[PDB]
């Protein structure tokens, strides 16, 4: 997996290219009940998460992803109070979720309680998240998780990995059925929603399913080096009619974006994150 | 090129590399001035590159070609006279002449042997060459610039800080430039430095990001100047219609692309601003 200081991220999701990262020391490395994990210590990225070979987060650009899937839903409702996370294995969503004064309770369900272990020891600035006295920690499949939960949650976060190993159940087209009736009337959710560089495709598709569920619909992204292409997207859907995900109905001032030690989401940002290029704008309208 | 993979490294972003898939070898030569590299890739079509850096991809060059046009086109009420400097593969030129505001495209590049490159294996970029509107120049467009002077309304640097003196004398009175600018999670330092200098010469400087898979990290930037004080580059003051985007042929650019490409993350907008 690491070849001549390298390791090497290949993926039939995104054949014909690979992000290699250079290693000045591999840290872990074991098999969990779900999925190959594996950490290393980068020359120029901090430690990075792998799993399955996908690489998860690097230290110096967790920070993009992580504040994106949380505030783009959190910024897009009035009071958000009750959170659920799927997946965030790493803390790091969690981090950016528990920053916020509204929120109380933030329910994470994550089913590989190794991935959470070794995020402890090696990804401490993201496993920070752990600590917050917000948090109810789950064991489980999201998938079957998101069955036990009815008008529950003001915004849902599933922060996975791609449709490929134990993540596979939560791009099921039914997962989003579930977390509508998870959600309250007025409830958000924001999931990792792939590359449209990429995955323009199921991007489409996704859309599509989606606005046959809920009134409100929408497709963000950001950019993140060490991402397939260097940018990932956020499938967005409201319940709430009025949700214009586009203009944050929770605009931050400089000095929350300060104080929450942001270095990427503000209110711009947020803003510019729905404009696409040509190419994807038409295919998604 | 190993085990089927051309791999891009380079010191200027360093322990990270992007690997594309090759199909087929395609050219392998020195020029005069730099070693041409074409490969057929598996999934990105034909691959440029030069001294093993990647300079276009037939997939995604249209994004990078698209805005370092249009950025500075759209950003000047009535250009006539573009100048290029670079540009071997002719992608910007076809994207400059697409203006019906354009007269002439001065390009000036050092390596003919790039434009032969291209035109056979960037067909879709050197149709460029095909317009009436070239005039093509052979040479060193740093020592080329110090011809000029009062002459462009709009100079694009497709590239591979005296330059930028040179560029404000050979533009017009209210001219405007746009140069490939680095990335800023790769050298916003540079980007720091750069747009300081740039600001001691010009009443109005930007800078602009596009995304492209195959640029390091995933993106690139743009230097915009302006020798007009009340240049505005964040709003174009040439929208587009839909009309226009659909006649163009644009897969990337558009006016609200054009708007939202100046909006960066909250890390570069601190370091540029605060
Ligand atoms: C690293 S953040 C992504 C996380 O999603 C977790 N994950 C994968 N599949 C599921 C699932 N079906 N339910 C909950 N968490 C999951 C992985 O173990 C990883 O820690
Ligand atoms: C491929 S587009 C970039 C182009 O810039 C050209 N180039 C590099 N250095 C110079 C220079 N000093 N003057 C003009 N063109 C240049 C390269 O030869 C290439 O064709």
């Excluded at 409100?216 to 990932?232: D, E, K, L, R």
Aim: aromatic share 10%.
């Amino acid at each position: 997996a690491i070849r001549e200081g390298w390791f090497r991220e290949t993926c039939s999701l995104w054949p014909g290219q690979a992000l290699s990262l250079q290693v000045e020391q591999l840290l872990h490395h074991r098999r969990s009940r779900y999925q190959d994990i594996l950490v290393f210590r980068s020359k120029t990225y901090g430690n990075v998460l792998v799993l399955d070979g996908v690489i998860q987060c690097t230290e110096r650009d967790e920070f993009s992803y992580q504040e994106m899937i949380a505030n783009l839903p959190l910024c897009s409702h009035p009071n958000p109070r009750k959170v659920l996370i799927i997946g965030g294995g790493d803390g790091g969503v969690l981090r950016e979720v528990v920053k916020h004064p509204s929120v109380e309770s933030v329910v994470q369900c994550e089913i590989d309680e190794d991935v959470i272990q070794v995020s402890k020891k090696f990804l401490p600035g993201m496993a920070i998240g752990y600590s917050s006295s917000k948090l109810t920690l789950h064991v489980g499949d999201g998938f079957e998780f998101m069955k036990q939960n009815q008008d529950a949650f003001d915004v849902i976060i599933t922060d996975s990995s791609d449709p490929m190993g134990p993540a596979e159940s939560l791009f099921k087209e039914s997962y989003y059925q579930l977390m509508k009736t998870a959600l309250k009337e007025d409830g958000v959710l924001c999931c990792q929603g792939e590359c449209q560089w990429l995955h323009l495709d199921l991007i489409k598709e996704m859309r599509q399913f989606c606005q046959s569920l809920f009134p409100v619909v929408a497709y963000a992204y950001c950019t993140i080096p060490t991402y397939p292409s260097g940018q990932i997207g956020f499938m967005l859907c409201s319940k709430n009619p009025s949700t214009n995900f586009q203009e944050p109905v929770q605009p931050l001032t400089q000095q929350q974006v300060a104080q929450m030690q942001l270095k990427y989401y503000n209110s711009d940002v947020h803003r510019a994150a729905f404009v696409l290029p040509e190419f994807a704008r038409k295919a998604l309208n």
